[PDB]
C-alpha cells in the first residue's frame, strides 16, 4: 500500500494545519481502520518503536542527536497483519517536552490529537512509571473531553458515560517502559508489569482530602481507559552503537529486547479494536479525513483556551486565589476591630492605612513572585475600589446615623413644641438659646462622621421655614 | 570521622520534622562546611553518586527494587578532602516523582530544603535536558526566593539582588545526565556537556508574547544560579548487574563512568564553595542547625499556599477566567442593551433574568465538567453580588435623576411660593392641587426607577415645612 509515511499534521512555530496531501491519500482508503497512534518525552525512541509496529526496516526517520527529528503527526496507512479487510494506521507524534521548542502548549496539544485519533493509544516513557507522567496523562484526559465537548453532539460528553456500550469508543490504553534495568519487585512479592501498573494507579483507603488528591488521578484514569497494559524493554545494545540501529538486523540486539517487542506487536495486533465514533459506526477513510479536520480546527480556531505552556501562570492564578484571601483579611480587620460608623475623615485614612500595612504583607507572605508588581498593582486597584465601597458605605451609615440622631433628639424636642409652644411672643429668642447652645452642643457626642457635618448644613437650610417664620412677630401684636 | 550517615528531616505521611540525634552531631561541629546537597527524578542513583562523593564503598543505602527506599534527607559529614579546615557535608533527598506517595506537595518542600541548605546543588536526571525538568526547577527556584522571604531579615530578599556580592550565597549548579546515549552534536556542531547546558539554556531573540513565556524559565534559571555545569554518565554495568552495584569495584564497570565520576568529584572538590549566609557569614554546625531549624518551621507553620498537585485542577480553575470572560459580557449587555435608569424593578429583574440566562450558557459553552458545580454556584453567588451592586447603582441612579426632575421641575414653584402671592388668604388654593399636578406630570414622565414613589414621598415628608408654615400665616390673615 504506501511505501513511505508521509506528514499528517503540520507544526510551524506554534501552528497545527491539516496537510491537503495526506488528506488526498486518506480519503482514498474505504475500509474500517485500526488507528495505533504514541506519545513521549523527545529522543526516546518512539519513532524506532512505530517501525517494528509496521515490521519493516527503514521508515519515519530515526536521528541520532540531541536534536529532535519528528516533528508535528506523522501517519502511516498499511494493511493490518493478522485482521483482514482492515487497515493499520500508526501515527507517529513529536515528542514532549522539547526544549528547543519550550513549549508545553502545543505538546499537550499534539498529546490530545494523538489520543483523540487513536482507537489503540500507546505511552512512552524512560526508567519507571512516574508520579509526573501520571499528572501528564491524566491532565490530558479531561482536555480530550474538552476538545469533544466542542465538536460532538451528544450522547457521550458530560451526560452519559456508562451503560452505552462506550467500552468501543474511548482508546484502549498502553503503558511502555524503556532500558527498564530495576527489579520488578514491591512490598516482597515480584510483580508482573500489569500488576506493577494496577499498584501505581490503586486506590488510597478511605476519603480525607489528601486521599481524595491522591485518587483523584487516577480514577479518571481508570474511567477514561476501560482496558489497560503495561510492557518492560531492556537497552536495545549493549553499548552505546545507538545511532545506527536503521542499519542492525536483529541478532545484534538483545534477543530479550527482540522478543519483547515482539510481544508488544502481537499483543497490538489481536487485541486492539476498529476505531469507531459515538454512535457504534465504524469509522472509515472519509470520516477520518472530517475527524482530523474538525479536531485541527478545534485546536487552532479561537475557543479551546489552554495556558499550560507556563508554571508562573498557575502560580500567578494561586497568586489570584491569595489576592481573595487577602481581601477576606483585609475586610476581617475592617469589619470585626472597627465600628460601622466613624468619627473623622482623616480617622478613616489612618484605619485604612493601618488595615493596608497588614493586608498588603498578608499578601507577599500568601502569594507568589508576580512579574513588574502587575498583581501587586492589581491588588492595589481592587483595595482602593474597596476602600471607595466602605467610604460610599460610610456616607450612608453615618448619613442614616445623623438622621436618625437628629430623629431622636432634635426631633423629639423640637416638632412638639413646634406646634404651640413657639406662638408665644418671643419663640425665636429662645429656640436660638435651645438650639445652638444644646442641640449643635450634644452633636459633639462622638462617632458623629465628618462626611455627615453636610447633613448639618441640609438640616439647617430646611429648617428656614421655621426659624423666623410661624408668626415670630407676636411681640408686635402684644 | 562519621562511619555512616544518619536522617535529618524525617518525612512520616507528610510532615517534616526535624531529628535531634542529627542536630546533636551537629552542634558539636565548629570548622566551616561546605554542602553539597542532591535532588533528582527517583530510582535514578541519587545515592549511589553521592557515595562516590564521600569515596566510600556501602554508605548511603540505595535499595534496588521499584520502590522507593531513600525517604526524608540524609546527612553526612567527613573531613573535606581537598580543603583543610573544612568539612564536606553531604544530603541525599527523596526522589521526586513518588508514585507510591503520590503527592507533589512534600517532593517541592524535600526540593526546596536541599536548594536552601546546599552550598552546592546537584540535579540529577535521566536521558536529557527536558523542559519539564527545567519547569520544575524554575517552579523550585521561585520556592525558595519565597521561603526565605519568611526567614530572612533583608540585604537579599526582594530589594537588592545584584552588586551585593551575592554570587557566594546562591548555589552552584551541577546538571548530572545519566545513562547518556544519544552523541553530542546540535546544528551539525559538536558539543561540550557545557554547551549543551547553555544550548538548552539559550534565550530567543526578540520580544513576542510567546517569547517571553519561552525565555521567562531560562532568565530565572541563569539568574539565581550563579554558575552552571552539566555532566554526562555512562551506563555503569553494560548488562542490568544492576542490584549489586554497592558491592562492585572499579574494573568491573566502564572506566568512561569511573572517569567522568572522577572528573565530577575533582569539580566539586575543587570548586565547591563554603556556605555563606546573607552578609557573608560563613557556616558551622551551630549554624547549620539553626537553617535547617529555622526552614522546616517555615515549611510547617502554615507558610504552604504554593501547590501543584493535580495541574488538571488548577486548569480547572481557569473557570475563573471564563467567570471573569461571561463577566464582561455581561456587563457589555447592561451598558448597550439596557439604559442606566431602567423602567421600575420588574423590567429590571426580567432583563437581568434573560441576561443571567446568556451569561449561563457563554458559561456552559465556555467551561466544562465543573466539580459538583462549584464553580456554577461561585459564579452565581458573584452575579447575585453583581445584581447587588447594579441594584445599589440604579438606587444612586434614580436618586440622581429623579432628584434632577423634581428640581428643574419644582425649583421655580419652591422659590415664588417662599416669596410670592402665597401669604393673601386663598393662596394655598392653586398649591393644593399643583403639587399632585407635579406629581402627576412626573408619574406621565417616563424612565423613574424602582425608588420613584419612594423619593418622592421623603421629598413630601421633608416639604411640609414650607406648607404648614404660611397654612398657619394665612390663618393671622383672613
Ligand atoms: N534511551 C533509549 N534510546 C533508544 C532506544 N531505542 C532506540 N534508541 C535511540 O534513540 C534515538 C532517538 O530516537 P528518535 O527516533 O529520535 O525518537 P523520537 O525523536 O521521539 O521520534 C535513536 O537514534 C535510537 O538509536 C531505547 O530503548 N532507549
Ligand atoms: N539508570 C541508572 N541506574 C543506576 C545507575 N547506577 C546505579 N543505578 C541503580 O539505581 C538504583 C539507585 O537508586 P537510588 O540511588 O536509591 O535513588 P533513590 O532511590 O532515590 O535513592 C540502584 O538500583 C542502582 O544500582 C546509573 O548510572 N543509571
Ligand atoms: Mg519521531
Redesign the interface.
Same mark, same amino acid.
Given at each position: 500500500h504506501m511505501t513511505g509515511p508521509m506528514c499528517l499534521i503540520e507544526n510551524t512555530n506554534?501552528r497545527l494545519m491539516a496537510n491537503p496531501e495526506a488528506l488526498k491519500i486518506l480519503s482514498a482508503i474505504t475500509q474500517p481502520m485500526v488507528v495505533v497512534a504514541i506519545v513521549g518525552?523527545?529522543?526516546?525512541g518512539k519513532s524506532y518503536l512505530m517501525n517494528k509496529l509496521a515490521g519493516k526496516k527503514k521508515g519515519f526517520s530515526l536521528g541520532?542527536?540531541?536534536?529532535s527529528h519528528t516533528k508535528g503527526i506523522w501517519m502511516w496507512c498499511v494493511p493490518h497483519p493478522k485482521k483482514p479487510g482492515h487497515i493499520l494506521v500508526l501515527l507517529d507524534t513529536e515528542g514532549?517536552?522539547?526544549?528547543?521548542?519550550?513549549?508545553?502548549q502545543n505538546?499537550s496539544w499534539i498529546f490530545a490529537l494523538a489520543v483523540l485519533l487513536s482507537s489503540t493509544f500507546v505511552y512512552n516513557s524512560?526508567?519507571?512509571?512516574?508520579?509526573?507522567?501520571?499528572?501528564?496523562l491524566?491532565?490530558v484526559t479531561?482536555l480530550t473531553?474538552?476538545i469533544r465537548?466542542k465538536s460532538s453532539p451528544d450522547e457521550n460528553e458530560?451526560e452519559v458515560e456508562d451503560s452505552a456500550d462506550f467500552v468501543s469508543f474511548f482508546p484502549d490504553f498502553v503503558w511502555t517502559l524503556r !532500558?527498564f534495568?530495576?527489579?520488578?519487585? *514491591?512490598?516482597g512479592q515480584p510483580?508482573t508489569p500489569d500488576e506493577?501498573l494496577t499498584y501505581?494507579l490503586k486506590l488510597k483507603k478511605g476519603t480525607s482530602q489528601?486521599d481524595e488528591?491522591?485518587n483523584?488521578?487516577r480514577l479518571c484514569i481508570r474511567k477514561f481507559f476501560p482496558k489497560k497494559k503495561c510492557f518492560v524493554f531492556?537497552?536495545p545494545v549493549?553499548?552505546?552503537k545507538?545511532?545506527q540501529l536503521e542499519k542492525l538486523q536483529d541478532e545484534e540486539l538483545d534477543p530479550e529486547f527482540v522478543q519483547q517487542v515482539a510481544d508488544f506487536c502481537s499483543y497490538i495486533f489481536s487485541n486492539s479494536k476498529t476505531k469507531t465514533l459515538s454512535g457504534g459506526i465504524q469509522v472509515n477513510g472519509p470520516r477520518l479525513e472530517s475527524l482530523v479536520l474538525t479536531y485541527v480546527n478545534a485546536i487552532s480556531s479561537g !475557543?479551546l483556551?489552554?495556558?499550560?505552556? *507556563?508554571?508562573?501562570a498557575?502560580?500567578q492564578?494561586?497568586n489570584?486565589?491569595?489576592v481573595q484571601k487577602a481581601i477576606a483579611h483585609y475586610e476581617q480587620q475592617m469589619g470585626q476591630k472597627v465600628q460601622l460608623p466613624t468619627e473623622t475623615l482623616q480617622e478613616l485614612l489612618d484605619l485604612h492605612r493601618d488595615s493596608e500595612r497588614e493586608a498588603i504583607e498578608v499578601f507577599?507572605?500568601?502569594?507568589?513572585?508576580d512579574?513588574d508588581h502587575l498583581f501587586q498593582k492589581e491588588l492595589a486597584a481592587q483595595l482602593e475600589k474597596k476602600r471607595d465601597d466602605f467610604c460610599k458605605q460610610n456616607q450612608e451609615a453615618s448619613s442614616d446615623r445623623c438622621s436618625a440622631l437628629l430623629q431622636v433628639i432634635f426631633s423629639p424636642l423640637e416638632e412638639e413644641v413646634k406646634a404651640g409652644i413657639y406662638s408665644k411672643p418671643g419663640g425665636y429668642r429662645l429656640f436660638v438659646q435651645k438650639l445652638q447652645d444644646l442641640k449643635k452642643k450634644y452633636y459633639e457626642e462622638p462617632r458623629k462622621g465628618i462626611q455627615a457635618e453636610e447633613i448639618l448644613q441640609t438640616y439647617l437650610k430646611?429648617?428656614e421655614?421655621?426659624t423666623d417664620?410661624?408668626?415670630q412677630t407676636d411681640q408686635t401684636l402684644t
Open positions: 506554534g518525552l523527545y529522543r526516546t541520532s542527536t540531541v536534536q514532549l517536552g522539547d526544549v528547543e521548542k519550550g513549549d508545553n505538546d524512560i526508567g519507571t512509571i512516574n508520579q509526573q507522567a501520571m499528572d501528564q491524566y491532565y479531561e473531553h474538552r465537548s458530560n !532500558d534495568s530495576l527489579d520488578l519487585e *514491591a512490598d510483580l506493577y501505581s489528601k488528591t491522591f483523584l488521578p531492556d537497552r549493549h553499548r552505546r545507538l545511532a !475557543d483556551p489552554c495556558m499550560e505552556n *507556563a508554571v508562573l498557575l502560580a492564578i494561586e489570584s486565589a491569595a507577599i507572605r500568601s502569594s507568589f513572585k512579574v430646611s429648617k421655614s421655621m417664620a410661624i408668626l
